[PDB]
Amino acid sequence: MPFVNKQFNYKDPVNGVDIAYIKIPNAGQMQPVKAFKIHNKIWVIPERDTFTNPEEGDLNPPPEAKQVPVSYYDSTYLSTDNEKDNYLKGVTKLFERIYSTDLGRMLLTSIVRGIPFWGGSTIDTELKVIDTNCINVIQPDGSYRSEELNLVIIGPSADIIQFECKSFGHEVLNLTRNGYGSTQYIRFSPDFTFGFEESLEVDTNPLLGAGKFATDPAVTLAHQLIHAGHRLYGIAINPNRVFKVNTNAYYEMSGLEVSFEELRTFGGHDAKFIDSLQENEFRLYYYNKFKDIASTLNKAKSIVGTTASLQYMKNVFKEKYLLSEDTSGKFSVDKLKFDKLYKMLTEIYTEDNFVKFFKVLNAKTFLNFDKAVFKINIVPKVNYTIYDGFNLRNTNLAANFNGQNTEINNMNFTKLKNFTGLFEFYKLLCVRGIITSALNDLCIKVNNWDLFFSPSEDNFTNDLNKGEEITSDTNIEAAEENISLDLIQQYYLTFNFDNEPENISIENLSSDIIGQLELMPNIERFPNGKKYELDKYTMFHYLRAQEFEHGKSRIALTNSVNEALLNPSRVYTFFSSDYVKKVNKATEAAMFLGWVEQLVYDFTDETSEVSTTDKIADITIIIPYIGPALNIGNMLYKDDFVGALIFSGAVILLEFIPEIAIPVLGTFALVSYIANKVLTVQTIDNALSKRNEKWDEVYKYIVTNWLAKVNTQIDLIRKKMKEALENQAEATKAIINYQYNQYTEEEKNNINFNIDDLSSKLNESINKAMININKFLNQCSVSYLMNSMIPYGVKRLEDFDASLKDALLKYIYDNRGTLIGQVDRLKDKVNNTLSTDIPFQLSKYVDNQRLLSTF
Amino acid sequence: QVQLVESGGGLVQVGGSLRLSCVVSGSDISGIAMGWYRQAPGKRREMVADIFSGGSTDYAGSVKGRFTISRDNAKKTSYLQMNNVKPEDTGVYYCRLYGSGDYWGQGTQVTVSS
Amino acid sequence: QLQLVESGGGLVQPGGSLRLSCVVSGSDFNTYIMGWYRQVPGKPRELVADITTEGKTNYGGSVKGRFTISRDNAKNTVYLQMFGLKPEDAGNYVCNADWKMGAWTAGDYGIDYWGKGTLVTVSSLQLVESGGGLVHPGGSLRLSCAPSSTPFNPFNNMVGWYRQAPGKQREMVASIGLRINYADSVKGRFTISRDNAKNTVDLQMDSLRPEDSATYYCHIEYTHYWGKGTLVTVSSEPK
């Protein structure tokens, strides 16, 4: 029952079975490397990946910096035996952790079942292995055997934290996306992880720790395993399908590369960035590719290069693709079994669902970009357990994701140099001097990943304007509700945990297996250092003004952004002028503790203010200082912000106003069926049901647009407010500490100040503020949805209803002969149904108790 | 009901160019992928090019750079431009609509001649 | 499920000796890998010594022959004999019962047993507290703290009462300075106050609940001044 049923040490002797030197497909001539078979069809190679790609043999930083927020290099990592032993144990521990969850047990079983298809012949009737889905296993006597395998975990390439799933290609076959599948090579390290900021959780967890949290490497590995799952079943989305962004405006990222395959794999809100028209195209496409496999098995009359029988191999693929087989031996794809399998691989196996099973803190979206790299070590039980990861039960790390908090659990996280420099990739944003005064421009650099995600309109497609023929055939969809924990359990119960495919004997391949990694689209660098001359101070200027670097002078707060940007000893605050005065005053040692007491009260009071309002649709609270914290709406003052918000609604928050384009909806054409009452009536019922679906389709589309175009904007402001609050705490702490350090050693001894206590209390206050800010911003996001996007859908939908009503009434009259005895009842039904809107229910489209309880 | 009708094809000189065409009737092709396949005698039918509704494409490795696939949602058509044709290209070509059924064109011969 | 109770800790002088013992409640004590781990606040447990089911011993890199671990199976007890104590040996000494399960240990899964520990301190103004005890739910207790200076009397400054239950992080219960603040869980039930004559900060606790059970500490805010603590236990009779 454990996934890894053997203890593996790097220096264990080879046995040619599960501990051996192996060779993998290669462009040139690789030497054998020591590897471990930790489970049927899965090997681990504790080596840096200098093998799989011949253009990637050097382990040093590259000439051109990778265009990624966090990268890390160390040519000496994983070069010693002890590191390789620790690497191996880390990976096996992580597999056990994944396997210990119902969801991971199901994913790993799917991976073992997902043998690459035997499509290596070009003969129409022959089953044959593809050799790049194999390895050579050297035996203790120095001979070798060849074996099929599904999955290899290997150490990273030069960028130690670039984790990804690689595989060898085919001259004609695109194995990862044509339904065949291919052996997957994951570059992965258990020895490092990412740090991310998170503030969404403060309401459920008000004592959430300060600073960065670490991603649990189990989540990270599970993410790569999910890609490996798609690719083994040949249903990966082509990497030329990317979510393209606008990059022209000053506030927009210079560039961003996020694949559809990535959005899918993340799940949650991110996967909903992809509209139904594209979703359904994919699903129909993979369905047809599975049908071709079934067909190819029906045409197969022989098998070569193994003693395994044709019956055995056909059966392996029956099970892999969950094909149906009739009593005559003929394979087919059942639509319902396919939809289940495809839904499990693409919607059940997601990062977001793994996070739910691990009960860990994790980024909620790919747009919550990693901010740091940490050295970790998960092998010792005192650091990390298979059931609890870092959050060890019955310790202070059990609650509030404390185990993942890199400041609280600092013995487990060593922060490394990020080799992406802070302004390696940036835009230069300059307030024209004359705006401030002729005086010099106020120009600041802004890190690429601090800018706004603005998705290209090309990403959102629909066929809403497309007419539709309605027939007596109901052609009516089922509900298809969102992946619940109960649904997952029901997949779990179905699941085949019985009989993995066997390790069969195949004939020996050549000593060097020739292979080239799958051809990838080339990616153009995005431009860098682009300069914008602006006629206003931006949120980026307001935020930068709140920062300070290393120095000797006493920092002073100022209510002037301009003063702060110009003087490294001056820091902008949106707090009151009384706070400025109180925090900046020379304070004698006898009044120090009273002064800190007051500042913490004032800091809390200022950051906890909430105004209530009845004058805004779907917004019942306002946090006024967001106005001057970030120059929202370019009004410098809170009164200006509260009023502006009442006057214009949630739109004043946005850096850009989305297009939400809903065309005239395609009209329904009804097939007539003279001489048949039941079919004519069915056609009227079908019209009305499809009209109900039409409202649902428009709403679902609008939500996708809103999630991607609007909610993302609000999320970033939410993150900048947390940064702004942190900046105020750090500045206030630096000033208080400077004052303390002016005192004599007698006064300090008497006072016995603990700056850690102050940090804690301020962090507590920041959490309380963020509870209010998150609730507020949530309201704004949903209000904007409710009041500025959805009504465009509603108007078009009511237009459609009105037209349909006329169509259906004409149809009843034109068929009143046939309908004789049924004309009046159908009139009422048509009239009733089409006289009232189908209410928008947000809960129907998005699952997040955060955005839903606003509704 | 759904019909795919191909046109074009025939004999072509090595190194030459040839365009195959297909028109879909009985269905819109908006939101549905399409593709071209080929099958040489005794051999398994293989995908040659794919094109998704939004225009993105995929190619068999060995035709990339020589073949281009295109579609027109408004006209419900697909075409396969074949340049620098090689003896390996000879066979029966088929257009496909990746819809809820088995939607294939009739099959059209392309013979590459030296 | 096993209970583990360590004894033997205390204050020791650099160079001095200690003998730790742990008695385990349960069965098949001789089934377990017994260990001693050292833990300091804000840090992971760290192995000091452990002993296999067969009596085989293992020691941390800092021990260097100074300590001896031993087990007595007929008494369900593990021992750690310690000599030449150093300032680096200071910490909570926690006994561990672990065992093999397949390729892993129960410790690796996370399901193994740990005691609360016995504290080891190594020697080189202060608040005192009192008024704790055992009460039924719905009962009352009054907690009290006083200090035991120049140029300032920081006791004059803001003072807070805190709570900590084993395995859980510390929390504030109430603070009194310019303002009186209460934890949300405690509002309407507890009252913090000052007695100038008596020179005390007090915490009246009414309508006590099982969940109030914890060691309560007094503190001068934003300083390192902390009291030793006073046990508060809210429980009904076993019946």
TrEMBL record, chain A:
A GO CC annotation recorded here is: extracellular region
> What is the protein's membrane topology class?
Multi-pass membrane protein
The Botulinum/Tetanus toxin catalytic chain domain sits at: 4-410
Looking at the record's lineage, which domain of life comes first? Bacteria
Swiss-Prot/TrEMBL catalytic activity? Limited hydrolysis of proteins of the neuroexocytosis apparatus, synaptobrevins, SNAP25 or syntaxin. No detected action on small molecule substrates
Localisation: Host cytoplasm, Host cytosol; Host cytoplasmic vesicle, Host secretory vesicle, Host synaptic vesicle membrane; Host synapse, Host presynaptic cell membrane; Secreted
Presence of the UniProt keyword Secreted in the record: yes
The residues covered by the Clostridium neurotoxin translocation domain are 538-855
Location, primary (coarse class): host cell
Please tell me where Zn(2+) binds in this chain: 223, 227, 262
Task: Report keywords, A-Z.
Answer: Coiled coil, Disulfide bond, Host cell membrane, Host cytoplasm, Host cytoplasmic vesicle, Host membrane, Host synapse, Hydrolase, Membrane, Metal-binding, Metalloprotease, Neurotoxin, Protease, Secreted, Toxin, Transmembrane, Transmembrane helix, Virulence, Zinc
* Family stated for the protein in its record: Belongs to the peptidase M27 family.
- What is the protein name given in its UniProt record? Bontoxilysin-A
Q: Which organism is it from?
A: Clostridium botulinum
